[PDB]
From a paper:
Galectins are multi-purpose effectors acting via interactions with distinct counterreceptors based on protein-glycan/protein recognition. We report here the first crystallographic information on the N-terminal extension of the carbohydrate recognition domain of rat galectin-5, which is precisely described as an N-tailed proto-type-like galectin. The overall fold in ligand-free and -loaded rGal-5 is composed of two antiparallel β-sheets (F1 to F5 and S1 to S6 strands) that form the characteristic β-sandwich structure. The presented data shows that the N-terminal extension can adopt an ordered structure and shapes the hypothesis that a ligand-induced shift in the equilibrium between flexible and ordered conformers potentially acts as a molecular switch, enabling new contacts in this region.
Our attempts to crystallize rGal-5 bound to the blood-group B tetrasaccharide were unsuccessful. Thus, we decided to test chicken GRIFIN (cGRIFIN) as a model for the binding of this compound. We were able to obtain crystals of cGRIFIN in the presence of the blood-group B tetrasaccharide. These crystals diffracted up to a resolution of 1.14 Å. The GalB moiety fully superposes with the galactose moiety of lactose, forming H-bonds with His46, Asn48, Arg50, Asn59 and Glu69. On the other hand, the GlcNacB moiety is rotated in the tetrasaccharide compared to the glucose moiety of lactose. The GalA moiety establishes two additional H-bonds, one of them linking the 6′-hydroxyl group with the NE atom of Trp66. The second one extends the binding site beyond the S4 strand, linking the 2′-hydroxyl group with Glu32. The superposition of the lactose-bound rGal-5 structure with the blood-group B tetrasaccharide-bound cGRIFIN gave an RMSD of 0.69 Å for all Cα atoms, showing the similarity of both complexes.
Author numbering:
A (entry chain C), B (entry chain A): 3 to 140
The structure:
């Protein structure tokens, strides 16, 4: 189920942060935050915390296929407890912070960063806030 | 021109805050922030700062007609200068704060508040941030 979508047609990458606060409803489901590129609604970045297995799966869906999964060594979420996830893009990575701690980086596979105009948040997350902010590049 | 859209299908009213930060590009154009209700994409609240005339026009577009304009001349904007607009809904009004000053309140005309699932930001605004927060008091 779609919980939140945002569209910024001029392209929200690189140099933008998405900050999502919320918590899961279940102990053993999952949610995803996807960054989609236009045209095609390809998934440039899929961030998928899976609470049954305590694994964060990251991937891209390009040319009608999922690529190689990048699975983080740790799982800094707790089911049913509030978290903050920030995803910030630079020229080379999506950088993921959870509760203000740097957790992982994911190298861009879709290189056409300015085509990433759409954010979707799906499945088991009760959102308390979404912030989309133009940070720039440092 | 659509600059930003957000969809929150469970309803973002009442008790949510939307904070928009940005600046205009022109000295004498205009932008609008619209809260839309589903089904129908009716405009529950249209917030339209008009820089040529220094007037904030507020209205609703329901049953295929604009209603009575509620116009504020406080116009605490300056062309090309960063601003912060916060729109917070309670059970009775949309409350508007600009640069942390309360400017106006607008009584709900669309009474089906939970049907307000969509935010659109159009025309002459260069967005630097959009934040959408439940329990908009915090
Ligand atoms: C079984 C399969 O086809 N793939 C397994 C991997 O699961 C997919 O992992 C992807 C990330 O690498 C996505 O998370 C994907 O789900 C998303 O995409 C699909 C379309 O592909 C749907 O839109 C989902 O709604 C969306 O979340 C995962 O596939 C889904 O879950 C699988 C377990 C399976 O039930 C699929 O049918 C379902 O679409 C899995 O991570 C990997 C390791 O276990 O094994 C692959 O086989
Ligand atoms: C001329 C007219 O039809 N209406 C005048 C008022 O202008 C409209 O004001 C509305 C709020 O009360 C909206 O701001 C509207 O613009 C929005 O909606 C229209 C569709 O109705 C379009 O989608 C626009 O893109 C959108 O911003 C205003 O109408 C627009 O501006 C007018 C000046 C005119 O050019 C219209 O054709 C255009 O749609 C105006 O504020 C009022 C002042 O007294 O006079 C009304 O007649």
């Amino acid at each position: 189920a779609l919980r939140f979508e945002a569209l910024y047609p001029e392209g929200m990458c690189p140099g933008w942060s998405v900050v999502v606060k919320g918590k899961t409803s279940s102990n053993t489901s999952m949610f995803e935050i996807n960054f989609l590129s236009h045209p095609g609604d390809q998934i440039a970045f899929h961030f998928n915390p899976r609470f049954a297995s305590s694994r964060i799966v990251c991937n891209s869906f390009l040319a009608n296929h999922w690529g190689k999964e990048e699975v983080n060594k740790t799982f800094p979420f707790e089911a049913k407890e509030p978290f903050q996830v920030e995803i910030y893009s630079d020229q080379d990575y999506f950088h993921i912070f959870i509760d203000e701690n740097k957790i992982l980086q994911y190298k861009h596979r879709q290189k056409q960063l300015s085509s990433i105009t759409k954010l979707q948040i799906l499945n088991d997350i009760e959102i308390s806030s979404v912030e989309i902010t133009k940070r720039g590049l440092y």
